[PDB]
């Protein structure tokens, strides 16, 4: 198993 | 450069990636995960994790409102940190405090520490990463990579920028290990 989850976009 | 770091983290120019899963021991004895694990005690047990470092302590939509007594009598040693995953943040104000805890953590012989946050993607990897540098003599491009290789991560550029400074304190104090 292995979900996509989120988030980090660092600007 | 922080740019030097962005590329270690991307997959060319632009694509950072996200955690295929909620917890990953990124270095022996040291695990980086998210909110749920943190709040899923029978798992921390099977994980034999004995210490928590909530690097995103609080009640906002971006914090985990856990706390000391929450971990009481399942006997898990706790340490909270009310940080903000924003470039403004000087998370680099808690490096020692954190490293100092991770060290006491490891010192027990079956010592396992869960450093976590919300997503286990910024605030969290960041502390951990800083612990490798001043505590395992590793240069920034290095810890990022181990950590990165072990978990899909992506710190904001502020946090990035904070590590570089760290890199040259150390490097120029001959604290490195090139």
mmCIF file of C-alpha atoms in Angstrom:
data_model
loop_
_atom_site.group_PDB
_atom_site.id
_atom_site.type_symbol
_atom_site.label_atom_id
_atom_site.label_comp_id
_atom_site.label_asym_id
_atom_site.label_seq_id
_atom_site.Cartn_x
_atom_site.Cartn_y
_atom_site.Cartn_z
ATOM 1 C CA UNK A 1 0.000 0.000 0.000
ATOM 2 C CA UNK A 2 1.084 3.602 -0.466
ATOM 3 C CA UNK A 3 -0.953 6.890 -0.513
ATOM 4 C CA UNK A 4 -0.153 10.337 -2.285
ATOM 5 C CA UNK A 5 -1.027 12.503 0.901
ATOM 6 C CA UNK A 6 0.472 16.176 0.780
ATOM 7 C CA UNK A 7 1.609 19.125 1.077
ATOM 8 C CA UNK A 8 4.907 21.322 0.872
ATOM 9 C CA UNK A 9 5.271 24.051 -1.768
ATOM 10 C CA UNK A 10 7.929 26.322 -0.323
ATOM 11 C CA UNK A 11 7.393 29.669 -2.335
ATOM 12 C CA UNK B 1 22.317 27.812 -2.597
ATOM 13 C CA UNK B 2 18.756 27.244 -1.529
ATOM 14 C CA UNK B 3 18.420 26.668 -5.233
ATOM 15 C CA UNK B 4 21.098 24.022 -4.837
ATOM 16 C CA UNK B 5 18.639 22.491 -2.345
ATOM 17 C CA UNK B 6 15.433 22.919 -4.427
ATOM 18 C CA UNK B 7 16.913 20.753 -7.127
ATOM 19 C CA UNK B 8 17.982 18.044 -4.679
ATOM 20 C CA UNK B 9 14.381 18.064 -3.718
ATOM 21 C CA UNK B 10 12.732 18.281 -7.095
ATOM 22 C CA UNK B 11 12.756 15.823 -9.975
ATOM 23 C CA UNK B 12 14.299 18.312 -12.501
ATOM 24 C CA UNK B 13 13.068 21.868 -11.938
ATOM 25 C CA UNK B 14 9.751 22.076 -10.393
ATOM 26 C CA UNK B 15 8.354 18.891 -9.181
ATOM 27 C CA UNK B 16 8.673 18.176 -5.534
ATOM 28 C CA UNK B 17 6.803 15.020 -4.560
ATOM 29 C CA UNK B 18 4.621 14.084 -1.664
ATOM 30 C CA UNK B 19 4.810 11.357 0.963
ATOM 31 C CA UNK B 20 3.678 8.080 -0.484
ATOM 32 C CA UNK B 21 3.019 7.241 3.178
ATOM 33 C CA UNK B 22 2.673 8.640 6.738
ATOM 34 C CA UNK B 23 5.808 7.616 8.526
ATOM 35 C CA UNK B 24 9.271 6.641 7.547
ATOM 36 C CA UNK B 25 12.271 6.029 9.743
ATOM 37 C CA UNK B 26 14.595 8.281 7.781
ATOM 38 C CA UNK B 27 17.707 7.296 9.753
ATOM 39 C CA UNK B 28 18.233 4.465 12.211
ATOM 40 C CA UNK B 29 16.059 4.931 15.226
ATOM 41 C CA UNK B 30 14.718 8.303 13.866
ATOM 42 C CA UNK B 31 11.196 8.358 12.281
ATOM 43 C CA UNK B 32 9.472 11.343 10.407
ATOM 44 C CA UNK B 33 5.695 10.998 10.010
ATOM 45 C CA UNK B 34 2.469 13.037 10.168
ATOM 46 C CA UNK B 35 -0.413 13.841 12.475
ATOM 47 C CA UNK B 36 -2.225 10.446 12.465
ATOM 48 C CA UNK B 37 0.714 8.259 13.508
ATOM 49 C CA UNK B 38 1.412 10.810 16.154
ATOM 50 C CA UNK B 39 -2.161 10.387 17.267
ATOM 51 C CA UNK B 40 -2.306 6.593 16.712
ATOM 52 C CA UNK B 41 -0.810 5.240 19.813
ATOM 53 C CA UNK B 42 -1.127 1.478 19.265
ATOM 54 C CA UNK B 43 0.953 2.033 16.235
ATOM 55 C CA UNK B 44 3.724 4.067 17.920
ATOM 56 C CA UNK B 45 3.824 1.077 20.272
ATOM 57 C CA UNK B 46 4.282 -1.597 17.553
ATOM 58 C CA UNK B 47 6.713 0.918 16.104
ATOM 59 C CA UNK B 48 8.336 0.780 19.495
ATOM 60 C CA UNK B 49 8.751 4.568 19.192
ATOM 61 C CA UNK B 50 9.280 5.890 22.727
ATOM 62 C CA UNK B 51 9.538 9.628 22.156
ATOM 63 C CA UNK B 52 7.509 12.254 20.383
ATOM 64 C CA UNK B 53 8.568 15.654 19.183
ATOM 65 C CA UNK B 54 5.581 17.485 17.901
ATOM 66 C CA UNK B 55 7.167 20.164 15.839
ATOM 67 C CA UNK B 56 3.788 21.566 14.907
ATOM 68 C CA UNK B 57 2.255 21.949 18.293
ATOM 69 C CA UNK B 58 -1.069 23.814 18.425
ATOM 70 C CA UNK B 59 -4.853 24.119 17.571
ATOM 71 C CA UNK B 60 -4.901 25.783 14.163
ATOM 72 C CA UNK B 61 -5.701 23.960 11.013
ATOM 73 C CA UNK B 62 -1.917 23.570 10.549
ATOM 74 C CA UNK B 63 -1.076 22.199 14.056
ATOM 75 C CA UNK B 64 -1.527 19.033 16.104
ATOM 76 C CA UNK B 65 -3.229 19.710 19.362
ATOM 77 C CA UNK B 66 -1.542 16.890 21.229
ATOM 78 C CA UNK B 67 0.490 17.642 24.306
ATOM 79 C CA UNK B 68 2.314 16.091 27.157
ATOM 80 C CA UNK B 69 -0.467 14.460 29.197
ATOM 81 C CA UNK B 70 -1.912 13.193 25.961
ATOM 82 C CA UNK B 71 1.165 10.910 25.937
ATOM 83 C CA UNK B 72 1.048 10.228 29.654
ATOM 84 C CA UNK B 73 0.662 6.659 30.828
ATOM 85 C CA UNK B 74 1.383 4.841 27.659
ATOM 86 C CA UNK B 75 4.669 6.120 28.796
ATOM 87 C CA UNK B 76 6.066 7.911 25.788
ATOM 88 C CA UNK B 77 8.385 10.826 26.452
ATOM 89 C CA UNK B 78 7.146 14.007 24.937
ATOM 90 C CA UNK B 79 8.376 17.279 23.710
ATOM 91 C CA UNK B 80 6.293 19.882 21.931
ATOM 92 C CA UNK B 81 7.230 22.778 19.710
ATOM 93 C CA UNK B 82 4.817 25.374 18.499
ATOM 94 C CA UNK B 83 6.164 26.015 14.999
ATOM 95 C CA UNK B 84 4.823 27.536 11.793
ATOM 96 C CA UNK B 85 5.375 26.130 8.400
ATOM 97 C CA UNK B 86 5.873 29.401 6.708
ATOM 98 C CA UNK B 87 8.997 31.021 5.289
ATOM 99 C CA UNK B 88 8.896 33.656 8.036
ATOM 100 C CA UNK B 89 9.440 31.151 10.753
ATOM 101 C CA UNK B 90 12.657 30.821 12.595
ATOM 102 C CA UNK B 91 12.406 27.179 13.331
ATOM 103 C CA UNK B 92 16.188 27.430 13.605
ATOM 104 C CA UNK B 93 15.474 28.893 16.995
ATOM 105 C CA UNK B 94 14.681 25.373 18.328
ATOM 106 C CA UNK B 95 17.588 23.341 16.645
ATOM 107 C CA UNK B 96 19.517 22.687 19.904
ATOM 108 C CA UNK B 97 16.422 22.076 22.080
ATOM 109 C CA UNK B 98 15.348 19.548 19.427
ATOM 110 C CA UNK B 99 18.709 17.932 18.761
ATOM 111 C CA UNK B 100 19.299 17.838 22.521
ATOM 112 C CA UNK B 101 16.001 15.766 22.831
ATOM 113 C CA UNK B 102 16.704 13.462 19.862
ATOM 114 C CA UNK B 103 20.056 12.725 21.577
ATOM 115 C CA UNK B 104 18.592 11.891 24.888
ATOM 116 C CA UNK B 105 16.125 9.901 22.931
ATOM 117 C CA UNK B 106 18.662 7.751 21.206
ATOM 118 C CA UNK B 107 20.865 7.312 24.346
ATOM 119 C CA UNK B 108 18.438 4.690 25.827
ATOM 120 C CA UNK B 109 19.285 1.559 24.198
ATOM 121 C CA UNK B 110 15.924 0.767 22.569
ATOM 122 C CA UNK B 111 15.368 4.432 22.115
ATOM 123 C CA UNK B 112 13.123 5.262 19.176
ATOM 124 C CA UNK B 113 12.013 8.884 18.489
ATOM 125 C CA UNK B 114 9.130 10.087 16.214
ATOM 126 C CA UNK B 115 9.828 13.628 15.055
ATOM 127 C CA UNK B 116 6.582 14.834 13.524
ATOM 128 C CA UNK B 117 4.354 17.624 12.307
ATOM 129 C CA UNK B 118 1.281 17.965 10.259
ATOM 130 C CA UNK B 119 2.312 16.425 7.005
ATOM 131 C CA UNK B 120 5.789 15.396 8.080
ATOM 132 C CA UNK B 121 7.098 17.419 5.124
ATOM 133 C CA UNK B 122 8.567 20.701 6.386
ATOM 134 C CA UNK B 123 8.828 21.648 10.086
ATOM 135 C CA UNK B 124 9.622 18.025 10.926
ATOM 136 C CA UNK B 125 12.217 16.976 8.359
ATOM 137 C CA UNK B 126 13.842 20.277 9.053
ATOM 138 C CA UNK B 127 14.638 19.680 12.705
ATOM 139 C CA UNK B 128 15.796 16.134 11.955
ATOM 140 C CA UNK B 129 17.951 17.386 9.110
ATOM 141 C CA UNK B 130 19.576 19.962 11.460
ATOM 142 C CA UNK B 131 20.240 17.211 13.947
ATOM 143 C CA UNK B 132 22.290 15.329 11.465
ATOM 144 C CA UNK B 133 24.405 18.306 10.657
ATOM 145 C CA UNK B 134 25.519 19.410 14.044
ATOM 146 C CA UNK B 135 25.284 16.018 15.535
ATOM 147 C CA UNK B 136 26.615 13.726 12.807
ATOM 148 C CA UNK B 137 28.994 16.140 11.239
ATOM 149 C CA UNK B 138 27.153 15.886 7.884
ATOM 150 C CA UNK B 139 27.004 18.740 5.258
ATOM 151 C CA UNK B 140 23.511 20.006 4.185
ATOM 152 C CA UNK B 141 23.377 18.452 0.819
ATOM 153 C CA UNK B 142 23.968 15.200 2.633
ATOM 154 C CA UNK B 143 21.311 14.972 5.361
ATOM 155 C CA UNK B 144 18.706 16.249 2.880
ATOM 156 C CA UNK B 145 19.486 13.421 0.594
ATOM 157 C CA UNK B 146 19.366 10.668 3.244
ATOM 158 C CA UNK B 147 16.264 12.096 4.671
ATOM 159 C CA UNK B 148 14.830 12.780 1.235
ATOM 160 C CA UNK B 149 15.654 9.357 0.002
ATOM 161 C CA UNK B 150 13.901 7.854 2.922
ATOM 162 C CA UNK B 151 10.764 10.057 2.733
ATOM 163 C CA UNK B 152 9.344 12.350 0.075
ATOM 164 C CA UNK B 153 9.840 15.772 1.567
ATOM 165 C CA UNK B 154 9.731 19.478 0.686
ATOM 166 C CA UNK B 155 10.749 22.337 3.064
ATOM 167 C CA UNK B 156 9.824 25.932 2.365
ATOM 168 C CA UNK B 157 12.598 28.078 1.118
ATOM 169 C CA UNK B 158 12.871 29.883 4.494
ATOM 170 C CA UNK B 159 13.611 26.635 6.239
ATOM 171 C CA UNK B 160 15.996 25.837 3.373
ATOM 172 C CA UNK B 161 17.743 29.137 3.799
ATOM 173 C CA UNK B 162 17.934 28.515 7.497
ATOM 174 C CA UNK B 163 19.960 25.269 6.928
ATOM 175 C CA UNK B 164 22.543 26.877 4.715
ATOM 176 C CA UNK B 165 23.422 29.373 7.323
ATOM 177 C CA UNK B 166 23.733 26.474 9.611
ATOM 178 C CA UNK B 167 25.972 24.839 7.040
ATOM 179 C CA UNK B 168 28.540 27.623 7.155
ATOM 180 C CA UNK B 169 28.533 28.127 10.867
ATOM 181 C CA UNK B 170 29.668 24.546 11.077
ATOM 182 C CA UNK B 171 31.740 24.428 7.957
ATOM 183 C CA UNK B 172 33.714 27.555 8.791
ATOM 184 C CA UNK B 173 34.073 26.354 12.512
ATOM 185 C CA UNK B 174 35.567 23.324 11.020
ATOM 186 C CA UNK B 175 32.655 21.430 12.361
ATOM 187 C CA UNK B 176 32.079 19.923 9.119
ATOM 188 C CA UNK B 177 33.258 16.603 7.733
ATOM 189 C CA UNK B 178 33.735 17.001 4.108
#
